[PDB]
């Protein structure tokens with residue numbers, strides 16, 4: 001399925017080249033521009049654990065998830081991966097625990113040492 005495919009066929013987008021964050025572009029977005037550090041970014045996403053369970057979805061809430069890019073408001077894999085996206089892009093990201101919740105996990109939904117799968121859609125980005 002999609003998690004296997006990004007694991008085996010994804011691009012390593014880490015600066016360290018440690019395969020900690022792998023990406024596939026699923027829907028090509030608009031032009032060349034990507035958000036910059038500090039932009040307000042608006043996304044839709046779904047996240048799955050390596051056991052196949054969906055742990056979260058913004059579409060199920062009928063509202064986007066909003067954060068300031070590059071400020072550690074989200075897991076490292078998102079600061080790295082959303083920074084690569086064009087407006088309107090949909091991507092798959094495979095996030096090893098060192099770029100996610102590590103050995104701590106996130107109680108209650110994410111276990112220790114969890115590799116996470118996301119589908120992310122970059123809806124918009126704005127400088128405030």
Ligand SMILES: COC[C@H]1CN(Cc2ccccn2)C(=O)[C@@H]2CCC[C@H]1N2S(=O)(=O)c1ccc2ncsc2c1
Nearest residue numbers: 045047055056065073074075078106107108109110116
């Ligand atoms: C609604 O969740 C928003 C956001 C959470 N954070 C930041 C954060 C703040 C405080 C504590 C932990 N994490 C994230 O970095 C990542 C990536 C952005 C999207 C979300 N997650 S998540 O991995 O999908 C996730 C993780 C745990 C969780 N518990 C129940 S729902 C759920 C969602």
